[PDB]
């Protein structure tokens, strides 16, 4: 199967997340996702089929994970954008006020602007550091959502927030609710991963 950021996957037939970024370490292939998606040796099923398992993850304190894929999986420098894809060019950080987009699961491809960064938030499952606040819509199951700029710059993966039973929190004014995601770069340095680019 092909590995593209924005393709949905499930964990142990329980948790709902989406592929963040295609990465590799030496001869090991995998992809970046959220920590609460599952623990080490949890079964990841991209497209509803077993592709590999979780290699490492950090929580609480953060919300990051690296999933180890089998050799049969192809890493593509792409982020899902409807019928099209966004070519991954780099992983630099966009300035606050800049427009950014992401690809999750339930809400799919959503866009917004950055309002703040370097945020630490206290979740029910523990605190998460290094979050970036945007006006992009957030819904449930979008965990691991692949944040990327129009310049093909990877931003990070969706952590989560106060999402309502309506399926999202973006129906709520931005002054009350927003979307948070954790910067990629830390993650790449955390596990020593190389981002697949084109």
UniProtKB/Swiss-Prot annotation:
Q: What pairs make up the disulfide bonds? A: 17-37, 101-111, 137-170
User: What residue ranges carry the coiled-coil annotation?
Assistant: none
Catalytic positions are 36, 63, 143
Q: In which family does this protein belong, per the annotation? A: Belongs to the peptidase S1 family.
Listed name of the protein? Alpha-lytic protease
The species this protein was found in: Lysobacter enzymogenes
Report the portion of the entire protein shown. 200 to 397 of 397
């Amino acid at each position: 199967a092909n590995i593209v950021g924005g393709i949905e996957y499930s964990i142990n037939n329980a948790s709902l997340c989406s592929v963040g970024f295609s990465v590799t370490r030496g001869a090991t292939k995998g992809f970046v996702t959220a920590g609460h998606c599952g623990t080490v040796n949890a079964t990841a099923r991209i497209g509803g089929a077993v592709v590999g398992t979780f290699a490492a993850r950090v929580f609480p304190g953060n919300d990051r994970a690296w999933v180890s894929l089998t050799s049969a999986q192809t890493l593509l420098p792409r982020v899902a954008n409807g019928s099209s894809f966004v070519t991954v060019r780099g992983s630099t950080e966009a300035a606050v006020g800049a427009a950014v987009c992401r690809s999750g699961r339930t809400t799919g491809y959503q866009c917004g602007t950055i309002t703040a960064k370097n945020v630490t938030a206290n979740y029910a499952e523990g605190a998460v550091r290094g979050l970036t606040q945007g006006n992009a819509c957030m819904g449930r199951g979008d965990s691991g959502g692949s944040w990327i700029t129009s310049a093909g710059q990877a931003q990070g993966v969706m952590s989560g927030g106060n999402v309502q039973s309506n399926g999202n929190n973006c129906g709520i004014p931005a002054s009350q609710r927003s979307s948070l995601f954790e910067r990629l770069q830390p993650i790449l340095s955390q596990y020593g991963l190389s981002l697949v680019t084109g």
